[PDB]
Amino acid sequence: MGSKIIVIISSDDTTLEELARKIKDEGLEVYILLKDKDEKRLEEKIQKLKSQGFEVRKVKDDDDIDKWIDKIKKERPQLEVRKVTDEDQAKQILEDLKKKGSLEHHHHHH
């Protein structure tokens, strides 16, 4: 219980967005922000995950990702909008949802 959404930023590898299925399984929604080297292979990936049931949006980079999340918070002041740029963070949110709240901080550095 507790309306929350996670935003997972896919970065070449697929482990980030497969974990997204396990996150939304806990009874919340996910949004994927796709970033790839080639915007054509990027665009197909968006459609692959939207077929699986992941609302994927095309962004520039982490600057625009930060603004994108700020936008979603302003539309939807009912829920947490979490940034997951690394796979480590996709495994952190696994524990986040079992705790049904948070660990320490609503942001990341490494």
Structural summary, described in words:
It is classed as de novo protein. Keywords: Structural Genomics, nesg, PSI-Biology, Protein Structure Initiative, DE novo protein. It forms a monomeric assembly. Solution NMR structure of De novo designed protein, rossmann 3x1 fold, Northeast Structural Genomics Consortium target OR157. The protein is De novo designed protein. The organism is artificial gene. This protein is an alpha/beta fold. It has one domain (1-110). Helices cover 45% and strands 20% of the residues. It contains 4 helices and 4 strands. It has helices at 15-24, 39-52, 62-75, 87-98, and strands at 5-11, 29-35, 55-58, 81-84. The protein has a 4-stranded parallel beta sheet, sandwiched between helices. α1 runs parallel beside α4. The longest helix has 14 residues, at 39-52. The protein is globular and about 40 Å long.
List the helices and strands and how they pair.
Layout: E1 5-11, H1 15-24, E2 29-35, H2 39-52, E3 55-58, H3 62-75, E4 81-84, H4 87-98
Parallel strand pairs: 1-2, 1-4, 2-3
What's this, in brief?
This protein is an alpha/beta fold and 110 residues long. The protein has 4 helices and 4 strands; from the N terminus they run E-H-E-H-E-H-E-H. It has one domain (1-110).
